[PDB]
Design a protein around this ligand. Sequence first.
Ligand SMILES: O=C(C1CCN(c2ccncc2)CC1)N1CCN(S(=O)(=O)c2ccc3cc(Cl)ccc3c2)CC1
Ligand SMILES: [Ca+2]
Length: 223
Amino acid sequence: IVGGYTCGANTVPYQVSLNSGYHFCGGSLINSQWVVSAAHCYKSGIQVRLGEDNINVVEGNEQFISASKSIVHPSYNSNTLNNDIMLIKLKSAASLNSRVASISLPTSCASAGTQCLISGWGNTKSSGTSYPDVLKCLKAPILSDSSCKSAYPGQITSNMFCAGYLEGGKDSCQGDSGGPVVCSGKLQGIVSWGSGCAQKNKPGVYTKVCNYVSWIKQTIASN
Ligand SMILES: O=C(C1CCN(c2ccncc2)CC1)N1CCN(S(=O)(=O)c2ccc3cc(Cl)ccc3c2)CC1
Ligand SMILES: [Ca+2]
């Protein structure tokens, strides 16, 4: 998270870490047994780490549950990063508490101007390489599709939305992918991509989760 701030221990309880030796992507806990992430973060043999603030130190509030099923969207395209959504089922149910809690799904899509919370343990430098130990947060407004399409000509699809600043400075970054973009307590987006980090006129693009609410619900029930 470039231009972010320390969230503060377990202030983002729904935030999970997709581990496979090292932290590679983020994610959200939508319910006791299901985690939502980005299809581009798909890896075989994932360990979902919950109750994490400082990823590098075992603060005892952690819960590490292996993934039993990984369900990537059928229409997902790696080239375009369209339909960059993936559902992961936990091997066992996460014990919900204060450090670990779920985030609700949206009933409607958000409007441009809506302030959202974007978080993760990803690169904080738009220039070099610097990764935090603790959880970083960033508040950014959902940009209008007019701005989004003008920022990325011929790249934005109806399943994507821009959030951040055309002045750059603040933006998600490498390693934040899969992470949550929560506006008003609803999971509205998933950290998908962007051209660089905090680049002027190049704000991060996120997966428009409200488009998949139906798919998600049917996927959750059947598996
Ligand atoms: O920073 C980036 C991208 C990463 C994706 N991206 C965004 C932008 C905004 N939001 C989400 C993702 C735009 C910048 N890259 C530099 C690093 N390369 S990399 O050599 O493939 C790479 C990949 C993973 C790494 C992990 C670590 Cl721990 C250190 C260096 C790494 C370097 C990929 C592009
Ligand atoms: Ca820890």
